[PDB]
Write a protein that binds this ligand. Structure first.
Ligand SMILES: CN(CCc1cnn(-c2nccc3c(=O)[nH]cnc23)c1)Cc1ccc(F)cc1
Ligand SMILES: [Zn+2]
Ligand SMILES: [Zn+2]
Length: 343
């Protein structure tokens, strides 16, 4: 009810301040769903045209091999040789790989879950780069300027997969497995162009139920690594989630829209056809407790030292936290302290 995905329509004035807007959507309860859609003002555009990127190199395209049955699957990401956007699009749009005919989303979603183990598609995933023009100042994924910037501030080391933008060139049936962000951070995803991207979300207050369910389904993966979901290989159909009483919601992201994922917000999804999305991680003051308590991959990976954040934002707790006495319990319903001005 209050864990349902929400869509926001900021005005141009409201859009200019990223962090303030994030605070605003949390004061509205957006974080409870674990995922929110943000439709930018009509006048806003991050790039004049996308007709000048055909020679853009996808260095490590991945063939997505999926094995499984009865709504439970494991995705094996097979590296293919480098290719350009032009070559990628030719494959995406060919008879062999293009989107099937469909009337309603529910029909396309059925095709996805029935055919994800067949005819493995190629995902032009994790390409370092941005499609934003240099002068765009609003919601610029390249430079959000959140408190996540503090790691680079004190050491200069940029952790690969954190605080840098990534591009994802999708084709029909390419997917992202169930996961939460690295260090349980926030994430932003903008669909630059093409066919939609469909998303599934589990509210952070029900995240441990999803983990317990995936542990029961893959006991071998769980014994090897407690945090095996962080490998981003596990696919679980909505039918299985429904059967085992895991609450979830679904949303389709169209070209020109943003998706925000919240700390400990489990999400998965798939691309409807040839498209391109830009993404990065970011943080608010609320994330600090999430980063301290993040259950990380012990086999295996992205790790951020919390010491800098605790020392700056929670110095009274520093000694208690460094001694293993920080017994703090996270309340997933509470908005970020920055949202106080809206409540
Ligand atoms: C380090 N790599 C990013 C990790 C990462 C974190 N969030 N996230 C995603 N989150 C949301 C949406 C998407 C999406 O549409 N498409 C791809 N990845 C998405 C992907 C690993 C990796 C990327 C893609 C993939 F398939 C499998 C592994
Ligand atoms: Zn993600
Ligand atoms: Zn692991």
């Amino acid at each position: 009810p209050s864990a349902r995905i929400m869509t926001f329509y900021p005005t141009m004035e409201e859009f200019r301040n990223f962090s303030r807007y994030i605070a605003y959507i949390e004061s509205q309860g957006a974080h409870r769903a674990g995922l929110a859609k943000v439709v930018p003002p009509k006048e806003w555009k991050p790039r004049a045209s996308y007709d000048d990127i055909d020679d853009l190199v996808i260095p490590a395209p991945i063939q997505q091999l999926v094995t499984g049955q009865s709504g439970l699957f494991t995705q094996y990401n097979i590296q293919k040789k480098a290719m350009t956007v032009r070559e990628f699009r030719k494959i995406a749009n060919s008879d062999k790989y293009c989107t099937p005919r469909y009337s309603e989303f529910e029909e396309l979603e059925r095709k996805y879950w029935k055919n994800l183990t067949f005819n493995p598609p190629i995902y032009g995933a994790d390409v370092n780069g941005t499609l934003y023009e240099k002068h765009v100042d609003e919601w610029n994924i390249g430079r959000l300027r959140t408190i996540l910037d503090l790691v680079e501030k004190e050491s200069g080391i940029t952790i690969e997969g954190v605080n840098t933008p990534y591009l994802y060139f999708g084709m029909w049936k390419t997917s992202f497995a169930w996961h939460t962000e690295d260090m349980d951070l926030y994430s932003i995803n903008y669909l630059h162009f093409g066919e939609p991207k469909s998303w599934y979300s589990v509210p952070p207050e029900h995240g441990k139920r999803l983990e317990r369910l995936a542990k029961g389904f893959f006991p071998g993966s769980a014994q090897s690594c407690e945090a095996f979901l962080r490998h981003k290989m596990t696919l679980i159909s909505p039918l299985m989630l429904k059967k085992y009483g895991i609450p979830f919601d679904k949303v389709t992201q169209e070209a020109g829209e943003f998706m925000i994922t919240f700390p400990y917000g489990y999400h998965a999804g798939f691309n409807h056809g040839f498209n391109c999305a830009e993404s990065t991680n970011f943080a608010t003051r609320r994330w600090i407790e999430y980063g301290k308590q993040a259950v990380l991959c012990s086999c295996r990976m992205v790790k951020i030292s919390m010491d800098v954040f605790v020392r700056k934002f929670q110095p009274e707790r520093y000694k208690l936290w460094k001694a293993g006495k920080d017994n703090t319990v996270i309340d997933h319903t509470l908005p970020t302290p920055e949202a106080a001005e809206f409540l």
